[PDB]
Amino acid sequence: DIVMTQSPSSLAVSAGEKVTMSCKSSQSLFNSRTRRNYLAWYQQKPGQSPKLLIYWASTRESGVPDRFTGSGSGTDFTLTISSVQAEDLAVYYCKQSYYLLTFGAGTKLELKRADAAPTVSIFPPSSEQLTSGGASVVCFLNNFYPKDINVKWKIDGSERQNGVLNSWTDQDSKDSTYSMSSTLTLTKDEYERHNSYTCEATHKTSTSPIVKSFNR
Amino acid sequence: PGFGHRATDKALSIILVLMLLLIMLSLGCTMEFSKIKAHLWKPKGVIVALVAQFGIMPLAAFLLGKIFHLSNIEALAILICGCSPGGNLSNLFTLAMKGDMNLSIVMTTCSSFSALGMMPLLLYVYSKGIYDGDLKDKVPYKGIMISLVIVLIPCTIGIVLKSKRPHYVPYILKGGMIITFLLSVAVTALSVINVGNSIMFVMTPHLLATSSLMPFSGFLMGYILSALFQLNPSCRRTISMETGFANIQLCSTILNVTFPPEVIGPLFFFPLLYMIFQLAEGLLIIIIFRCYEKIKP
Amino acid sequence: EVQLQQSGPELVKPGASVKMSCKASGYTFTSYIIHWVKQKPGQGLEWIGYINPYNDGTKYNEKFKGKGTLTSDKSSSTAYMELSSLTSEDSAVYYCARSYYDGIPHYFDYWGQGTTLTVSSAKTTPPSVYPLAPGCGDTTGSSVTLGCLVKGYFPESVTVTWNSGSLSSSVHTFPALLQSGLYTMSSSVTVPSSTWPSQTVTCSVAHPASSTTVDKKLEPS
């Protein structure tokens, strides 16, 4: 079979700087009989069906903007945009049909930002949650641009990291930054036995991770 | 495209069926049976003819498709035409070469038998990048058997008639040669009205070149392969004339059953073009051979 | 021009026995073949197989050979897909695409709207809303954040609103992801600390799939 691997898979460009999306496939998927070079570049905006952009890896479907251009042969292919607009933020897969229909991993495009100023918020379960037979402690991080960020829970000086759930925001259109949430759910008879539940957030914008402690 | 295909289609089928039956009777009415038994007991030209037909013609079609950059449907069509048993028209025209006509019976029989069991495998092996589907079950076997029986049964009747009453042979044959001749015109124009206009449809330089080079390469390669095996010149002529010809009906039916008519736009008349081209080359080679015999009688 | 119509989202028990329909009436149905593509949420597209409506030939991917089953109807110009084997991980979005087929499928020039298939035990239950309030000796600051988490709701059709809050300004709605059968989401809104005691904040949870419109106001510790 043939497997397609896309190198970057994630990049952010603000206004005009060009992008290069490349998938090297496995072998030379070029037909010797017909100079067709079977390969298709698609676009999939969030909450929408995939849209075809380029077929035969060199020719673009009618109606697409002229900024999208694709060039490649053999195993090496590239898709580039002369000027990136706000409507070009989607996922591209560079599907192939030489032998069997296989799709690529996908490349996600974002919007660049100067820096990030994340804020830490921690909250313990309410009284009615405790009376309901369980407990849930929730910590969320607000207004951080880069995706690479980690969280950790120190309970009585011990690293548990058990039964935690994480969720990410979908980069709201107001600003390229977005938030993250994390929840820890524990049964009764042990919430008051441990206490502490200190939270730590590690992000690349600060060498020292931000630590927030909780009591009672 | 052809809006209507009911313009005496059944009448055309029946008139060609009658033509084939009558000319098969006339052809088998002037050839023996003992030489067929000798050919079966010592098979030397049959084996080389079969290997040339099923090991070179598909290879020639594949190479021509690769060189001339035919599309997937065109490459499939030429490959199917190449890997096809010798048509009845090859037996029809090998009488002019007057070469070992008794061998042609076992030739057609063995070609049909080998095709029946080899067309799926021999078509699957060369279908790399063309028609990823199985395609094994889409080849018509009943049509091959029908062609086989229509070739053989009147041939057997004619052989028995010649063996029983030779005195009746000249009367039924020569007059039959008239019946198959004039009626040809009676159907030839019937094709012209049926085909209509196809100059801007099927005439493509790549397709024209492939259809020119396929039967010519078949004839040349068959003759050369017979020459290197040190066979009788009549045997060489009949092997070449059988391996050069191909059956277009099988290709037409398989293309019709495996793809809709919308997809095969100009390929519908491609078998007809191939038939016309092989008729032209056969007539040309008959004239050349007759002239070469005339200059040295 | 040409459009592909999908049946619509379907929820089914893990007992399988589901059918997916894709209608294509913009062209000659038999001229083009229909492919089916599966997409998990956040895992990218995945090919399943295609069907030729003319000769009823189907080609399947190796992974989906056992479960996939593609049929075609020329009279209705429709393509049907049956899996007959579903698990909790089989919930995904399925797209039907149209492609030309000379000898090899070229490309998917037209796609369907996409159908969401969910496989779970169902058993819809009313959601429960628990607010989040600080005040355990913290000094807070210029701006304080608040929210109300929701638990124990089966379907995704749930919305969280802040009529008395900051509305669309400085609001974060974390999407829910399945866990332990029933999934949960969260919402966060930040308001100035000086103006918070003056105007109480209330959060409302709307669950159109059920008959609950519970709303509540949090209280500082």
Answer whether residue B28 is part of any domain.
yes
Class of domain C4-119: mainly beta
Choose, out of B69, B73, B76, B128, the residue to mutate when testing the contact with A (most A CBs < 10 Å): B69
Answer whether residue B225 is part of any domain.
yes
Q: Which domains does chain A have, with CATH numbers?
A: 10-110 (2.60.40.10), 119-212 (2.60.40.10)
3-state secondary structure of C33: strand
With contact defined as beta carbons under 8 Å apart, do C208 and C221 qualify?
no
Asked if C172's CB is within 8 angstroms of A169's CB, the reply is yes
3-state secondary structure of B19: helix
Q: A207: phi > 0 → left, psi -120 to 50 → alpha, else beta; which?
A: alpha
Report the greatest alpha carbon distance in chain B. Answer: 59
Asked if C174's CB is within 8 angstroms of A181's CB, the reply is yes
In 10 A of CB A122, how many CB atoms? 19
Tell me, in Å, the resolution of the deposited structure: 3.1
Phi, psi torsion values for C85, nearest 5 degrees: -155, 100
3-state secondary structure of B60: helix
Answer whether residue B65 is part of any domain.
yes
Q: Rounded to an integer, what distance in angstroms lies between the CA atom of residue C217 and that of residue C165?
A: 11
Q: Rounded to an integer, what distance in angstroms lies between the CA atom of residue B78 and that of residue B35?
A: 35
The DSSP string of C68-119 is -EEEEETTTTEEEEE-----TT--EEEEEEEEEESSSEEEEEEEB--EEEEE
Helix residue spans in chain B (DSSP H): 9-28, 34-41, 45-55, 57-68, 72-82, 88-93, 101-125, 142-164, 169-195, 205-228, 233-244, 248-258, 270-295
Answer whether residue B2 is part of any domain.
no
Tell me, yes or no, if B137 comes closer than 8 A to chain C by beta carbon. no
Which residue on chain A is closest to B68 by alpha carbon?
Answer: A33
Distance of alpha carbon C25 from its chain centroid, rounded?
26
Q: How far is CA C38 from CA A43, B51, C96, C155, in A?
A: 16, 48, 9, 21
Answer whether residue B135 is part of any domain.
yes
Answer whether residue B276 is part of any domain.
yes
How many C-alpha atoms does C89 have within 13 Å on its Cβ side? 1
Examine domains C4-119 and C128-217 and report if their fold is the same: yes
Q: Rounded to an integer, what distance in angstroms lies between the CA atom of residue C67 and that of residue C83?
A: 5
Q: Which residues, 6 or more positions from A78, have their beta carbon under 8 angstroms from its beta carbon?
A: A20, A21, A22, A70, A71, A72
Q: Rounded to an integer, what distance in angstroms lies between the CA atom of residue A98 and that of residue A33?
A: 13
How far is the alpha carbon of B130 from chain C, nearest alpha carbon, in Å?
Answer: 5
With contact defined as beta carbons under 8 Å apart, do B208 and B57 qualify?
no
Asked if C134's CB is within 8 angstroms of A95's CB, the reply is no
By Cβ distance, the residue of B71, B73, B260 closest to C30 is B260
With contact defined as beta carbons under 8 Å apart, do C190 and A142 qualify?
yes
Q: Rounded to an integer, what distance in angstroms lies between the CA atom of residue B217 and that of residue C5?
A: 52
Tell me, yes or no, if C115 comes closer than 8 A to chain A by beta carbon. no
Answer whether residue B84 is part of any domain.
yes
Residue A157: exposed, middle, or buried by beta-carbon count in 10 A (0-12, 13-18, 19+)? exposed
How far is the alpha carbon of B205 from chain A, nearest alpha carbon, in Å?
Answer: 16
- Pull the structure tokens for residue B43: 């098979």
Q: Rounded to an integer, what distance in angstroms lies between the CA atom of residue B23 and that of residue B28?
A: 8
Tell me, yes or no, if C30 comes closer than 8 A to chain B by beta carbon. yes
Q: Rounded to an integer, what distance in angstroms lies between the CA atom of residue C150 and that of residue C215?
A: 11
Q: Rounded to an integer, what distance in angstroms lies between the CA atom of residue B148 and that of residue A166?
A: 73
Its sign, for the CA torsion A46, A50, A56, A60, is negative
Q: Which residues pair with C78 in a beta bridge?
A: C23, C73
Residue B125: exposed, middle, or buried by beta-carbon count in 10 A (0-12, 13-18, 19+)? exposed
Its sign, for the CA torsion B49, B50, B55, B56, is positive
For residue B78, what are the domain limits? 9-295
By Cβ distance, the residue of A32, A33, A35 closest to B70 is A33
3-state helix, strand, coil in chain C (%, to 5): 0, 50, 50
The DSSP string of A18-78 is -EEE-B--SS----SSSTT---EEEEB-TTS--EEEEETTTEEPTTS-TTEEEEEETTEEE
With contact defined as beta carbons under 8 Å apart, do C189 and C170 qualify?
yes
DSSP class of residue C29 equals G
Phi, psi torsion values for C130, nearest 5 degrees: -120, 115
How many domains does chain B divide into? 1
Q: Rounded to an integer, what distance in angstroms lies between the CA atom of residue B228 and that of residue B196?
A: 45
With contact defined as beta carbons under 8 Å apart, do B21 and B192 qualify?
no
Q: How was this structure obtained?
A: cryo-EM
Q: Rounded to an integer, what distance in angstroms lies between the CA atom of residue B147 and that of residue B247?
A: 10
Q: How far is CA C171 from CA B40, C167, C174, in A?
A: 92, 7, 10
First to last CA, chain C: 61
Cα torsion through B32, B35, B37, B38, rounded to 10? 170
Asked if A126's CB is within 8 angstroms of C112's CB, the reply is no
Report the greatest alpha carbon distance in chain A. Answer: 75
Tell me, yes or no, if B80 comes closer than 8 A to chain C by beta carbon. no
Answer whether residue B212 is part of any domain.
yes
With contact defined as beta carbons under 8 Å apart, do B179 and B241 qualify?
no
CATH number for B254: 1.20.1530.20
With contact defined as beta carbons under 8 Å apart, do B148 and B112 qualify?
yes
Asked if C45's CB is within 8 angstroms of A103's CB, the reply is yes
**Cβ neighbours of A169 in C, within 8 Å:** 172-174
Distance of alpha carbon C141 from its chain centroid, rounded?
38
Could you tell me the CATH superfamily of domain C128-217? Immunoglobulins (2.60.40.10)
Choose, out of C3, C6, C50, C108, the residue to mutate when testing the contact with A (most A CBs < 10 Å): C108
Q: Which chains touch B (3 or more CB pairs under 8 A)?
A: A, C
Q: Rounded to an integer, what distance in angstroms lies between the CA atom of residue C33 and that of residue C59?
A: 11
Q: Rounded to an integer, what distance in angstroms lies between the CA atom of residue B221 and that of residue C187?
A: 80
- The label of the residue with tokens 């929730």 reads A138
Q: Which residues pair with C116 in a beta bridge?
A: C93
By Cβ distance, the residue of A55, A103, A172 closest to C107 is A55
Domain-wise residue ranges, chain C: 4-119, 128-217
By Cβ distance, the residue of C109, C134, C136 closest to A215 is C136
In 10 A of CB B201, how many CB atoms? 17
